[PDB]
Structure 1
Amino acid sequence: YDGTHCKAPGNCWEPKPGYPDKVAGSKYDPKHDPNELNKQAESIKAMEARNQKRVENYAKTGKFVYKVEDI
């Protein structure tokens, strides 16, 4: 692995001598829980939705309110 041998443009990764091609099934498998992985995105979606409410409220009344339960 010297970073100069490329399967495609912008994709030059090779496994090192002795290390595997794919990690799934190997001793270095990350074994990620698919639900843990998705948490971020869902937290972002919820944040985006509460912000959307704050903007809607500023547009309706002319007065900014942060707390969504007081809207």
Structure 2
Amino acid sequence: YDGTHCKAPGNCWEPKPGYPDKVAGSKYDPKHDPNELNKQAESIKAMEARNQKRVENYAKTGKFVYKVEDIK
């Protein structure tokens, strides 16, 4: 693996000698919980929702409020 042999433009990864092409079902299967993987994006949507609630409130009233439970 010298990084030179590319299967496509921008894609030149190869396994090292003695290592699998796919890690799924192998020695080094990362075995990730899908539920844990999805928590980041779920958290960001929550923030963007609270953020939009703060913006629209700031726009209508003209006074900024951070605490969304204090927003009508």
Q: TM-score, normalised to structure 1's length?
A: 0.99
Instruction: Provide the C-alpha distance between the structure 2 equivalents of 1:53 and 1:21, rounded to a whole number of angstroms.
Output: 46
TM superposition shift of 1:8 = 0.1
Task: Show the counterpart of 1:54.
Answer: 54
For residues 36-69 of structure 1, the C-alpha deviation after alignment (integer angstroms, 9 at most, x for no partner) is 0000000000000000000010011000000000
Q: TM-score, normalised to structure 2's length?
A: 0.98
Instruction: Provide the C-alpha distance between the structure 1 equivalents of 2:23 and 2:32, rounded to a whole number of angstroms.
Output: 12
In the alignment, structure 1 segments of 5+ residues that lack a partner are none
Task: Show the counterpart of 1:3.
Answer: 3
In the alignment, structure 2 segments of 5+ residues that lack a partner are none
Instruction: Report the number of matched residues.
Output: 71
TM superposition shift of 1:19 = 0.5
TM superposition shift of 1:33 = 0.2
Aligned-CA RMSD value? 0.3
Q: Secondary structure at the match of 1:53?
A: helix
Instruction: Provide the C-alpha distance between the structure 2 equivalents of 1:45 and 1:26, rounded to a whole number of angstroms.
Output: 34
Q: Which runs of 4+ in 1 moved over 6 A?
A: none
